[PDB]
Design an enzyme around this catalytic site. Structure first.
Site, PDB file in Angstrom:
ATOM      1  N   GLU A 268       0.860  -1.206   0.000  1.00 34.99           N
ATOM      2  CA  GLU A 268       0.000   0.000   0.000  1.00 34.99           C
ATOM      3  C   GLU A 268       0.903   1.266   0.000  1.00 34.99           C
ATOM      4  O   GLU A 268       0.652   2.263  -0.693  1.00 34.99           O
ATOM      5  CB  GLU A 268      -0.910  -0.018   1.228  1.00 34.99           C
ATOM      6  CG  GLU A 268      -2.078  -0.980   1.160  1.00 34.99           C
ATOM      7  CD  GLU A 268      -3.108  -0.687   0.059  1.00 34.99           C
ATOM      8  OE1 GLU A 268      -3.023   0.352  -0.619  1.00 34.99           O
ATOM      9  OE2 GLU A 268      -4.034  -1.511  -0.154  1.00 34.99           O
TER      10      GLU A 268
ATOM     11  N   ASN B 156      -7.397   8.802  -5.644  1.00 32.10           N
ATOM     12  CA  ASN B 156      -8.185   7.790  -6.338  1.00 32.10           C
ATOM     13  C   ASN B 156      -8.957   8.389  -7.515  1.00 32.10           C
ATOM     14  O   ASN B 156      -9.275   9.580  -7.533  1.00 32.10           O
ATOM     15  CB  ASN B 156      -9.150   7.077  -5.351  1.00 32.10           C
ATOM     16  CG  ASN B 156      -8.442   6.421  -4.156  1.00 32.10           C
ATOM     17  OD1 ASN B 156      -7.476   5.680  -4.320  1.00 32.10           O
ATOM     18  ND2 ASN B 156      -8.934   6.694  -2.946  1.00 32.10           N
TER      19      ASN B 156
ATOM     20  N   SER C 282     -11.473  10.760  -4.075  1.00 31.90           N
ATOM     21  CA  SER C 282     -11.066  10.511  -2.685  1.00 31.90           C
ATOM     22  C   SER C 282      -9.526  10.329  -2.788  1.00 31.90           C
ATOM     23  O   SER C 282      -8.950  10.174  -3.886  1.00 31.90           O
ATOM     24  CB  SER C 282     -11.792   9.284  -2.120  1.00 31.90           C
ATOM     25  OG  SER C 282     -11.315   8.122  -2.750  1.00 31.90           O
TER      26      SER C 282
ATOM     27  N   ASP D 298      -6.215   8.274  -0.571  1.00 29.17           N
ATOM     28  CA  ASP D 298      -5.747   7.282   0.415  1.00 29.17           C
ATOM     29  C   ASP D 298      -4.524   7.837   1.139  1.00 29.17           C
ATOM     30  O   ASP D 298      -3.627   8.408   0.526  1.00 29.17           O
ATOM     31  CB  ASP D 298      -5.307   5.986  -0.297  1.00 29.17           C
ATOM     32  CG  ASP D 298      -6.464   5.130  -0.847  1.00 29.17           C
ATOM     33  OD1 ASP D 298      -7.646   5.441  -0.583  1.00 29.17           O
ATOM     34  OD2 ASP D 298      -6.104   4.101  -1.530  1.00 29.17           O
TER      35      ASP D 298
ATOM     36  N   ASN E 296      -8.878   5.447   3.122  1.00 29.24           N
ATOM     37  CA  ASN E 296      -9.580   6.221   2.112  1.00 29.24           C
ATOM     38  C   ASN E 296     -10.543   7.274   2.658  1.00 29.24           C
ATOM     39  O   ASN E 296     -11.420   6.925   3.459  1.00 29.24           O
ATOM     40  CB  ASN E 296     -10.428   5.277   1.262  1.00 29.24           C
ATOM     41  CG  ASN E 296     -10.764   5.873  -0.059  1.00 29.24           C
ATOM     42  OD1 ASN E 296     -11.523   6.759  -0.158  1.00 29.24           O
ATOM     43  ND2 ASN E 296     -10.195   5.344  -1.073  1.00 29.24           N
TER      44      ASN E 296
HETATM   45 CL   LIG Z   1      -7.944  -0.549  -1.480  1.00 27.67          CL
END
Ligand SMILES: [Cl-]
Ligand SMILES: [Cl-]
Ligand SMILES: [Cl-]
Ligand SMILES: [Cl-]
Ligand SMILES: [Cl-]
Ligand SMILES: [Cl-]
Ligand SMILES: [Cl-]
Ligand SMILES: [Cl-]
Ligand code: NA
Ligand SMILES: [Ru+3]
Length: 129
Positions: free
Chosen positions: A35, A46, A50, A52, A59
């Site tokens: 990640e 994203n 949104s 992250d 998120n």
């Molecule tokens: Cl995800």
């Protein structure tokens, strides 16, 4: 902060993630690797607008508030910036809510695609935990 592999493992364990909702410590370290590459400061936008945030790429559509994600919730009741701190407490407490939400760690797409089913114990190999 860029954590080391075993350093992050110890931190996660201390904060009660090892076997949380039945996910072993290697699962959590593996998710963090793919990640964030163990970088607390990681942010990624994203396609839906949104963003992250942090080691576990939490998120802003559901979990944290960043003030720029229309129509979104803040279920962890935290500014998204709190997820970028060197201290992983907020990220871990928020991950605990996420993983409890019904789909377990499948919430983390990188976990489902890169960790699920694999030899995740390799991620804590060699660490004194
Ligand atoms: Cl995800
Ligand atoms: Cl690594
Ligand atoms: Cl493990
Ligand atoms: Cl960003
Ligand atoms: Cl917002
Ligand atoms: Cl806020
Ligand atoms: Cl920490
Ligand atoms: Cl992926
Ligand atoms: Na939000
Ligand atoms: Ru801590």
């Amino acid at each position: 902060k860029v954590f080391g592999r075993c350093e992050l493992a110890a931190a996660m364990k201390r904060h009660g993630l090892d076997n949380y909702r039945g996910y072993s410590l290697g699962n959590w370290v593996c998710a963090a690797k793919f990640e964030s590459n163990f970088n607390t400061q990681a942010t990624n936008r994203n396609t839906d607008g949104s963003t992250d945030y942090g080691i576990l790429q939490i998120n802003s559509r559901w979990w944290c508030n960043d003030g720029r994600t229309p129509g979104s919730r803040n279920l962890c009741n935290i500014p998204c910036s709190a997820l970028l701190s060197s201290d992983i407490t907020a990220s871990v407490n928020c991950a605990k809510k996420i993983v409890s939400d019904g789909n377990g760690m499948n919430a983390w797409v990188a976990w489902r695609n890169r960790c699920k089913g694999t030899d995740v114990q390799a991620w804590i190999r060699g660490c004194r935990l």
